Design a protein around this ligand. Structure first.
Ligand SMILES: O=C(NCC1(O)CCC(F)(F)CC1)c1cc(=O)c2cc(F)ccc2o1
Ligand SMILES: O=C(NCC1(O)CCC(F)(F)CC1)c1cc(=O)c2cc(F)ccc2o1
Ligand SMILES: N[C@@H](CCCC[NH3+])C(=O)O
Ligand SMILES: N[C@@H](CCCC[NH3+])C(=O)O
Lengths: 517, 517
């Protein structure tokens, strides 16, 4: 903790005894009956309003507000400052004869203007009561009648313009980002706005929002390494959920026809520009829908969010791809292709012309996959691998990629046409990244067992594979009966990244996962 | 050992699968389109002139499409009558040998539509129904079914209507069965979702920004609890699951965010009972420039708003499960407000400030069951908190704010503005004998905060049941940057849901509470 020895800390802390000896509490209890700076600007900026002399004569509107002192200049009889309040700034003016310090007696040893000069500091949080006016240059300003010290800050303001090291530190010390950077402030406001837009759209579709456990005795609904923890009351290993799917499907068996949940899931994997081990996703299930109904719902949801954030526009610019800035159009309907078509269109491989061995030669010679990944892969697995290596990077515009091999998931019905090698699944891609996963949901309880047992026997032969056993409570609930349903999941942090031009998932998380010092 | 897979009725129902399929009917079809909710059918047509059964046979009444679970069925010769359950609403259905068709059943098939409905369908199956509305002689809204579609063949039967203690205890695990068979359980969980939407609506209208902060952290704090511990593979690092929301949100206030709240799960690795589940939902909210008196008004206004919105503008609520018998509690604001010392006098019979510590001890010895270890060396403030715990808390049935706690009860709270540094500007809200809310005039003096956390370390160092817990240094640095004066509260939302749904146990307001082996 190197700041405890910095000059500025020792200098500021020594002002505490000085301020308290003047009978002033440097950490008081409240600052009631005030207005937000932005609300003052909203009410009075576009207004006929007086000059400094009208404020000196107490003729202009009186206001109370509070915030952080981020600029100060003494001009003798007068001093000027800037107050930052919740992403808004306003100028303040102190005058030797007009301005008082709350708590500073008239017979104290120091004048108000010198108290302001010498006992306050940049970074201190002040309560300001005074009179509005406009400078002739047009700057909205407050002539301060009383300044109240609300918090004596003990370290200096952050460097406003962060170098690379400061930017890394501020992923932990996020308060320094929020004080310093209008852009970080907008990014997180937009994130909150996006969450409200999602809830509003879902609720207008009569989806009910629910909560289901993060700590479970099993984990499933996705392919991921889990987090493990011990519950002391039962002396039991628990897993943190990796998805929402199984719990929500039980609520369908329970009779709820439309449910969704927005919550954290945990995948104990690597960390990079698109991967934080703790992330936020929505899963939503609608009885009597299929993946086609889900496809219209997902693209309409996103278009609606984009239109609400961009004054009706559906085009959005994203600046940080290795290939340069791109403009992506979220206007529905999005591009729709089967996995097989996308491999043909973007990979240059018409898959159904090549035997399994030819598909391995393509993977072996045209990709950098290790031999163990394809040498014994089934035809469907080979097709999915071709998609991963030859297609996924190329899907910059929004795409729905449909009709995946059966091997990709055990929880999805096969194509209603009768092709049992493909499922009624789509994944949505934008900016080279997966955004959405969606199924015509499997509710045949015998078929569901068959697929999960198949998945367990296949996994049990891979050394690096996670042994989780069959969820029998899930199978029993399907025996009770799940309606036909369509479901989807959306990685919300990734979506926020697309709609805020964030280079990394760390820019949309207040406190992302960081290495220890 | 899965028991239903060996039960006669499982064999009985699975047998129908091949039979139905040999009729060319898919027992798990892909969708049921243009499907209305039953509740939406009732909303248009119950308060409505509607024909009788003969007008429905004439196809002259409104035609509807809907879906749900067959839960009652009685054949009456050429007619049969049933009840469909769709998402907490029920509607009666009528089949008729001449009027009703089974989707996908051929005329040249060897079974009639009515016999199919009798022989191949079961209570539990999920059906799609299209037909004409009418009123029975007794006034019941009914649908004469033109076409029934098998939407899901159920392989076990409806849950038994008479559940014992053990039959109901299995249903806390097998919650889908509870939801199917209990209207009280269905309504409890619908009320829970409404409560969550109402909390958000209220906080959003007070201009709080909703945020998310991490569950997985390198530290834990903001409450007294045993944490859950897990391992983050990518960093080979031990992590804690958050026990509260407080530290992360206070950092956001330092960042200049004036009003934030979060609704999410916290994890306390404690014992389980009617008011404790190791994973539970809370809201924390912080407002710059407020104190605990502002927070107190905010809390009671929020809860009164929720109660009023859920009970047609009433503020009184019935709760049935206290030992004292069925009560009625009024959530109308302002709630009863007392200091902890007043409450020990009013409800406990002890004027604490007329007693020495050793006399506070004698009281705890003779008038409670506390182990001598709990109080033999406790400080005066600690003695007073135990006197409250043992003599007052159970008696607070009507909503109370209990203010001005001993400093020992928390390290994160400012002391009384009167100058009494043995008490802090904290309140807890109680209702039905249970803590509901915890709130501070938040501590933002960095040196005082460090002092209080150090004294906690020394106190905890003497307990061999508490492992060593370092001081959150980044938190202290954020306070050094400067936190405004602030008021914050936390509310246990599950306990809140319990008090408004007449739930005996927290297990009743969670879909999947923690359960023994
Ligand atoms: O948004 C993400 N993925 C896209 C989805 O797969 C999310 C789940 C779905 F919403 F259901 C379908 C779309 C995402 C973000 C992460 O931070 C992350 C971290 C990991 F360790 C592992 C996977 C991760 O995945
Ligand atoms: O609602 C609860 N308590 C009330 C509060 O203390 C919650 C925190 C606050 F919201 F900040 C102020 C009010 C509650 C519910 C549990 O299931 C639970 C489980 C545990 F293992 C330990 C404590 C628990 O506490
Ligand atoms: N559980 C899926 C999301 C929903 C897929 C459709 N049921 C996942 O995590 O990928
Ligand atoms: N974090 C607190 C609630 C907020 C108290 C006021 N800052 C708790 O868990 O009890």
């Amino acid at each position: 903790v190197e700041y405890l020895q910095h000059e500025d800390y020792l200098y500021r802390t020594s002002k505490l005894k000085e301020i308290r000896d003047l009978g002033i509490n440097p950490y008081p209890y409240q600052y009631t009956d005030c207005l937000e700076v932005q609300e003052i600007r909203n009410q009075f900026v576009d207004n006929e309003l007086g000059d400094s002399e009208a404020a000196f004569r107490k003729e202009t509107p009186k206001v109370r507000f509070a915030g952080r002192l981020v600029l100060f200049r003494s001009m003798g009889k007068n001093a000027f400052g800037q107050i930052l309040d919740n992403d808004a700034k306003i100028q303040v003016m102190f005058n030797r004869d007009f301005s008082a310090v709350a708590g500073l007696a008239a017979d104290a040893g120091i004048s108000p203007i010198k108290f302001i000069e010498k006992k306050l500091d940049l970074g201190d949080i002040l309560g300001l009561e005074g009179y509005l006016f406009f400078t002739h240059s047009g700057e909205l300003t407050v002539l301060v009648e009383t300044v109240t010290l609300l918090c004596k800050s003990l370290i200096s303001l952050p460097d406003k313009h962060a170098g690379l090291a400061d930017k890394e530190i501020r992923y932990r010390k996020r308060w320094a980002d929020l004080i310093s950077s209008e852009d970080v402030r907008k990014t997180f406001l937009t994130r909150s706005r996006i969450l409200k837009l999602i809830r509003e759209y879902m609720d207008q579709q009569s989806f009910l929002e629910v909560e289901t456990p993060i700590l479970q005795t099993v984990y499933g609904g996705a392919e991921a390494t889990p987090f493990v923890t011990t519950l002391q009351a039962l002396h039991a290993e628990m897993f943190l959920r990796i998805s929402l799917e199984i719990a929500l499907k039980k609520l369908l068996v329970g009779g709820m026809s439309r449910v969704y949940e927005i919550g954290k899931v945990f995948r104990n994997e690597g960390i990079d520009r698109t991967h934080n081990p703790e992330f936020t996703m929505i899963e939503a299930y609608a009885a009597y829908w299929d993946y086609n109904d889900v496809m219209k719902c997902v693209e309409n949801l996103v278009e609606y969010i984009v239109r609400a954030l961009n004054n009706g526009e559906t085009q959005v610019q994203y600046s940080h791809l290795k290939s340069g800035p791109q403009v992506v159009d979220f206007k529905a309907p999005w591009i729709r292709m089967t996995m097989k078509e996308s491999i043909s269109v973007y990979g240059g491989v018409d898959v159904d012309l090549h035997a399994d061995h030819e598909l391995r030669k393509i993977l072996e010679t045209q990709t950098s996959l290790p031999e163990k990944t394809y040498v014994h892969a089934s035809r469907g697995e080979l097709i999915a691998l071709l998609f991963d290596e030859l297609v996924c990077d190329k899907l910059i515009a929004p795409h729905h990629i449909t009709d995946h091999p059966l091997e990709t998931t055990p929880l999805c019905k096969t194509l209603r046409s009768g092709d049992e090698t493909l499922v009624e699944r789509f994944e949505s891609f934008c900016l080279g990244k997966e955004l959405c996963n969606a199924y015509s949901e499997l509710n045949d309880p015998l078929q569901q067992r068959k697929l999960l047992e198949e998945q367990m026997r296949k996994k049990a032969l891979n050394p690096d594979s996670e042994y989780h056993p069959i969820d029998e409570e899930f199978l029993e609930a399907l025996c009770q009966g799940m309606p036909p349903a369509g479901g989807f999941g959306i990685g919300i942090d990734r979506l926020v990244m697309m709609l805020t031009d964030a280079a990394s998932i760390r820019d949309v998380l207040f406190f992302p996962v960081m290495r220890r010092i």
